[PDB]
Structure 1
């Protein structure tokens, strides 16, 4: 083919717009992608806007460079290498400030 605009009876749309080179899927309830090898996205900016939660259910999540978070909870321990600088509050272990 050379065009893609599908509008479904529930109001969902799957479309590709060449004028702005924009692929859109909208108005759906669920999507599920099952693959036996890999799923890859290669693009400068990825935005995941999830009003409930993003779950990465995997043995390993790897962030290759920087990871920034508002708050952190580590449930079962870990390791830190390099310089770790804490500021702007109290660092405590088993109820004892350091």
Structure 2
């Protein structure tokens, strides 16, 4: 056909509105999509507003350019290439702080912090 406009007894909406070219699904509890090949979305802007969590349960997540986050937790290691510029706190490894650490010196005293 030529239309999609559904109002359900639970208050859900599933429709397409060609005047504004808007596909709307609202008022549902769950959605799922199960496919054997691929799911693709091609659009300038993707917004996911998830008040609990977004889980990407996969061997690999690839971000092709920039990734921005508030906090980061890495569990099992990694690699980094390129200039990595840390500021605004301490970058420590096993308690040793990059910008402030000292060493025993070579003649019995202590070095200063990094120059």
Query: Which structure has the bigger radius of gyration?
Result: 2
Q: Are 1:23 and 2:23 counterparts?
A: yes
Between the aligned partners of 1:45 and 1:55, the Cα distance in structure 2 is 19
Q: How far 1:96 sits from its partner (Å)? A: 1.4
Is the strand fraction higher in 1 or 2? 1
Residue-by-residue CA offset, 1:27-47 (whole Å, 9 max, x unaligned): 000001000000000000000
Larger RCO, structures 1/2 (Cα 8 Å, 6+ apart)? 1
Q: In structure 2, how many angstroms separate the alpha carbons of the residues matched to 1:36 and 1:15?
A: 26
State how far apart, in whole Å, the 2-side matches of 1:84 and 1:53 are: 28
> Cα deviation per residue 1:54-82 (whole Å; 9 max; x = unaligned)?
00000000000000000000001000011
1:87 to partner: Cα distance: 0.8
Unaligned runs of 5+ in 2: 98-114
Number of residue equivalences: 98
Q: CA RMSD in A?
A: 1.2
- Unmatched segments (≥5 aa) in structure 1: none
Displaced runs of 4 or more, over 3 A? none
TM-score using structure 1 length? 0.97
